[PDB]
Amino acid sequence: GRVIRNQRKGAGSIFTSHTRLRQGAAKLRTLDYAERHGYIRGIVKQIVHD
Amino acid sequence: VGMRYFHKQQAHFWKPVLNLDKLWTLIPEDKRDQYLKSASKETAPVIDTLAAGYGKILGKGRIPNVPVIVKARFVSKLAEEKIRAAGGVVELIA
Amino acid sequence: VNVPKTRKTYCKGKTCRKHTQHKVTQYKAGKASLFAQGKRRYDRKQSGFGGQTKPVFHKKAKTTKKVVLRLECVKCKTRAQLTLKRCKHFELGGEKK
Amino acid sequence: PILKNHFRKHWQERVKVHFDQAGKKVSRRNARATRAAKIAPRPLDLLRPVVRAPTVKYNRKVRAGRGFTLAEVKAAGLTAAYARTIGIAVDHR
Amino acid sequence: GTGKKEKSRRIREGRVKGENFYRDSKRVKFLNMYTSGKEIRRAASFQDSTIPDAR
RNA sequence: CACGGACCAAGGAGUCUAACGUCUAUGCGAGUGUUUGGGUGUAAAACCCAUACGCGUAAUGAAAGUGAACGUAGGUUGGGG
RNA sequence: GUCGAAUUUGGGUAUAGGGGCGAAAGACUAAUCGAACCAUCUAGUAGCUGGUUCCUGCCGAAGUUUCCCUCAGGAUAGCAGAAGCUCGUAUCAGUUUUAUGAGGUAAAGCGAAUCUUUAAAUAUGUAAGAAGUCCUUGUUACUUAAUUGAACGUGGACAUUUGAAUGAAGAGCUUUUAGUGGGCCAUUUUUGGUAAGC
RNA sequence: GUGAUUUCUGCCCAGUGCUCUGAAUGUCAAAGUGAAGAAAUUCAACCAAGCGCGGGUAAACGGC
RNA sequence: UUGACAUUGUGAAGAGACAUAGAGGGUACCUUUAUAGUUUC
RNA sequence: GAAGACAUUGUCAGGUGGGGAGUUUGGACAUCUGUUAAACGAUAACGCAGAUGUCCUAAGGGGGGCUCAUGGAGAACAGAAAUCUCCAGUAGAACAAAAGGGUAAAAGCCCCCUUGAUUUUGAUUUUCAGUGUGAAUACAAACCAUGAAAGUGUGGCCUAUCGAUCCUUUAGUCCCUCGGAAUUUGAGGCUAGAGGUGCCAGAAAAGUUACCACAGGGAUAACUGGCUUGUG
């Protein structure tokens, strides 16, 4: 027969994630020297819908 | 049917026969009559069958009374026996 | 059926050429011997792609085999084969009727 | 009778017919005249030895070989390298 | 693959066309009775159209 | 009341080849086949030719092998002339 | 039918043939989809259908045998033509007559048995001579007690009434190949069937 | 897979398909190991997964 | 998906066998021992 | 930072593998007796009533003896119902089995000896192309069995009981070949059997399509030959 539905997902033709409105990738801070041997102080500026 | 024979080449099997019927065609015509008018063991006409292109001498018909020297690679039993009736020998050339 | 262990039949071994005493045996097929001609041609042909190449016989209908009965002489030891008809129960020697 | 013809292949592509048999012969004799003017005093072919043929069927005959030897050229009294310029074939093997 | 063959299954357990790992050997003659009555151009089964001998 | 045909002109279907069988014509005949090739030329024609080679003159064997007159190449029977 | 939203639509862009895409009909993918279109392999294969082009002369069939995964077809035999060859009255014949065989059907019979005691008509086998008969004795490793016999002969004897009738555009022999291998009807016999253009 | 809501979903792990914290010497390839032989070669012992055996599972196919 | 071979090295322990290195020791033998070695799990 | 002589990657090997690829998915067939079958033979139908894919070292051979099925008249037990005995008994019994033949000093029943159910290859009969397979009959050369002897015996009293090519395997010879020349293993040959194709003159093989495709075939009912009506 023809190719069933779940075999056709992995091509990524029309199934790619909708990503126009996303703010950015939600990651922690990159582990530098100051975060590995002390602390650093940061300000939260706005909390926002993604 | 039989056994198989790998790499056959018809140069190991070249051996054309020659009946004692012919046996005088190898001598040319103008020399043919002279040795028939001689029963001499002194002068027997030498026949070299290998130069004519004949492997084996076979005895089929009967030859005249004249003694003949025959040179060949192979002769048979009745072919060699019939020449000794005429008083001729067979020299096995190779 | 029931055949005797001893049987006096004609021999041929360049000396006997007469009715001499024999001993009975039953024929059994030999070992397959994979270095024969047919096995080596069959093994080279199955090697590779293509799957099965020779026919493989399926439809069996017979229920018996022919009794093949070879007889060993006791003087010259020349063996000679001899056959019977198709039969189902084949014992030999004992149980005289 | 059974007769074996080997024509299942696409044989009509590879058919060569020799209409140039009388054409190439005329174009070959013009080579043996053009060479005979370039090689102008010289006899157009080297000198060939005398050789007895192999293979029991044919050993009764004698045949023109390829070249003489390093030995037959020495016994005639000349070197091998001077022999090829005079016009004499030399086979080393 | 090598195990799920007709020749290699019957050796594990210990002839009509269509015997499988499924139904049985006897079900194949049974379930072919739904297509049994046909005449092939051999007349159809249970209609022989012949006169027997009634003694 | 099975299929094709409205009418006219022009096209339109047992062909060529390789290996053969029976038969017939011609050449030579224990031989035969010049044309792969060479020589020659009025130039793809014609004419000439060497050594080979193919088939034939011996068969039978799976083979190693062996290999055809007792005799007017025989006796009997029927035979054209 | 629905008409503020799972709405409608322009442009841009993404997915391409055993692949796409599908709120799922095997739908749609340039009037083509239970597998697009283009060119090549390709003049693919057909045991099936249709067609096959001038005239006269002579001869002239088959639907049947056995085998085949054979039943719309092949191979084989039969029937047919052509080429002729050896010879020339000749061996003969879809026929009768004389002689002698084999049959078990209709009838007859159950005071025959339980399915034949008897036995036609029509059909059928073989003879009607020269490759014969007769006489005599030659050969042999067979045969006999034995040259006894068998078989083949040497030699001798018997002509066209030489062994019934009628007839005989010759008789014998050999190659070689075509088409056919779907049949059907009537008298008489008979099966199966109530009977049937069965 | 099923198809809002209200309401209700009983029994069977034999087959079939899964599954495993199970079992252990039943079958069991190549490679390697041992023996015989002049050698090619042959017979042996050993042998992973799977299979086989044992356990689980039915809002898994199902049989109700 | 599972096994073997290759990629693929080096250590310290352990369990063996040999090569070597002396002593003893009833062409040898063989219980012993040292070391500097080559390898087997 | 993590991990480390393991993973990864390469090559072979087993397990799984309609997710995918290619293809297939037969049309009283081999036989023997009776009858249909119409006085040689041959002769059909999805005619017909029945048998076979076996069985037996004797149920094969040879020789000697003997008479069966059945009835009548009788013998403590014992009767219709064992054994005994006589009279009649053309077979009314029996022979491995279907069926048709044939069989009485036997082809049956009992005893005596045995392996001819052997070796070598031809001729012939049946189906038939007068090919094969099967089965059968009569001889010749051996070597045997048996019988006092003639004779008989090449399986079963006659008609049914079965199998090519390639491959595997044994027996025969102790032979032939391994092609540079020998030895020893190994392999291939000539001769004669076996292992089997029951679709039995011999392919290795599951379904569905109403989504269907193609090349072709075949329809049309209602006049049999007085064919149909009211009386089982």
Side-chain angles (χ1 to χ4, degrees):
Chain A
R2 72 179 71 253
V3 169
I4 67 173
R5 183 176 65 239
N6 59 0
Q7 287 181 350
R8 207 178 71 197
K9 258 65 184 298
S13 67
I14 65 171
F15 302 101
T16 60
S17 176
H18 299 99
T19 178
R20 181 180 60 90
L21 293 176
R22 287 193 174 99
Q23 297 290 323
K27 290 181 170 65
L28 294 170
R29 180 180 166 86
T30 304
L31 191 144
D32 52 352
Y33 170 65
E35 194 172 0
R36 193 173 61 237
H37 283 277
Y39 61 91
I40 195 166
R41 192 184 73 182
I43 297 98
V44 54
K45 188 61 69 179
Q46 58 182 356
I47 65 102
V48 67
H49 181 76
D50 190 76
Chain B
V1 177
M3 77 279 287
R4 297 176 296 175
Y5 186 83
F6 304 101
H7 186 71
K8 192 166 182 288
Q9 42 184 350
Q10 282 75 241
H12 297 286
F13 295 101
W14 183 74
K15 194 188 288 185
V17 303
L18 180 60
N19 300 117
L20 290 177
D21 277 335
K22 300 294 191 292
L23 201 268
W24 289 92
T25 67
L26 304 178
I27 300 166
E29 171 66 26
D30 295 332
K31 302 294 187 292
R32 190 179 297 173
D33 292 333
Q34 296 178 358
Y35 297 103
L36 293 177
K37 200 251 181 66
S38 66
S40 66
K41 296 179 184 292
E42 302 292 326
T43 62
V46 173
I47 291 173
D48 194 357
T49 64
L50 186 60
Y54 292 98
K56 193 173 185 181
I57 296 299
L58 302 184
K60 195 259 184 67
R62 291 179 291 176
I63 62 170
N65 206 167
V66 179
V68 174
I69 293 171
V70 175
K71 295 191 289 180
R73 292 180 182 174
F74 298 97
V75 293
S76 67
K77 186 174 181 179
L78 193 144
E80 199 277 333
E81 187 179 2
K82 198 184 293 291
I83 299 172
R84 288 186 179 272
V89 301
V90 172
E91 294 181 351
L92 294 175
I93 48 96
Chain C
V1 296
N2 191 1
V3 296
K5 289 183 180 291
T6 62
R7 183 169 178 173
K8 185 178 263 77
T9 186
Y10 185 80
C11 179
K12 50 181 183 294
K14 295 287 187 179
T15 60
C16 296
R17 290 179 179 176
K18 67 178 183 179
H19 287 83
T20 61
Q21 180 60 48
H22 295 87
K23 298 184 288 184
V24 74
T25 53
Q26 189 173 1
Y27 177 78
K28 302 296 180 182
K31 189 66 177 176
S33 179
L34 65 95
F35 292 97
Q37 184 66 40
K39 177 72 173 177
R40 292 172 295 170
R41 183 179 295 117
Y42 181 75
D43 293 334
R44 182 170 173 84
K45 188 170 183 176
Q46 295 297 106
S47 68
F49 298 109
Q52 185 64 43
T53 65
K54 293 284 187 180
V56 176
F57 184 77
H58 295 290
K59 295 177 182 177
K60 188 179 186 294
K62 295 293 191 293
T63 61
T64 61
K65 293 180 173 65
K66 290 182 180 179
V67 170
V68 186
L69 183 143
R70 67 182 181 181
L71 298 170
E72 183 172 2
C73 180
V74 299
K75 292 180 182 178
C76 60
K77 295 183 289 294
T78 295
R79 292 182 180 176
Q81 297 175 357
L82 197 148
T83 181
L84 275 71
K85 290 182 181 179
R86 292 184 183 271
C87 67
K88 292 180 180 178
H89 295 283
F90 175 70
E91 64 183 1
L92 77 163
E95 193 69 29
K96 184 65 68 67
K97 187 183 289 184
Chain D
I2 48 96
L3 48 94
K4 296 175 75 173
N5 298 121
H6 299 86
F7 281 152
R8 289 188 180 272
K9 296 179 177 180
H10 291 285
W11 61 274
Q12 291 182 357
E13 294 181 355
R14 286 95 62 191
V15 172
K16 183 168 82 270
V17 283
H18 296 283
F19 299 117
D20 50 359
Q21 182 178 0
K24 292 166 78 70
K25 182 181 178 181
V26 177
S27 292
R28 194 183 301 117
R29 296 182 72 205
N30 293 321
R32 288 191 291 269
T34 302
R35 183 180 173 88
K38 182 178 173 66
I39 309 300
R42 300 193 290 119
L44 293 175
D45 56 352
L46 303 173
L47 199 278
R48 287 292 185 270
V50 175
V51 160
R52 190 171 295 275
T55 69
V56 189
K57 185 176 181 178
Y58 293 112
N59 61 0
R60 68 184 187 272
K61 292 290 181 68
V62 78
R63 184 179 62 85
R66 180 177 176 87
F68 278 93
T69 36
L70 302 179
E72 292 164 358
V73 172
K74 186 184 286 186
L78 76 162
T79 66
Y82 177 71
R84 291 184 176 97
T85 66
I86 295 301
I88 296 168
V90 174
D91 189 80
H92 58 91
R93 70 178 73 89
Chain E
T2 306
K4 289 183 180 179
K5 294 177 182 178
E6 291 290 327
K7 296 293 182 178
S8 295
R9 189 186 69 250
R10 292 190 290 115
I11 296 173
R12 193 267 307 276
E13 295 181 356
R15 191 177 295 114
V16 181
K17 293 182 178 181
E19 179 176 359
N20 300 321
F21 171 74
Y22 293 100
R23 294 83 163 259
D24 272 330
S25 65
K26 291 183 179 181
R27 293 287 302 276
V28 182
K29 182 65 69 68
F30 178 71
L31 293 175
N32 286 318
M33 81 176 179
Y34 291 101
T35 62
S36 179
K38 295 291 185 182
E39 58 182 0
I40 297 168
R41 294 182 179 93
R42 190 262 172 87
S45 66
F46 283 172
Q47 285 184 353
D48 286 332
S49 180
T50 185
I51 278 85
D53 185 69
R55 296 294 184 184

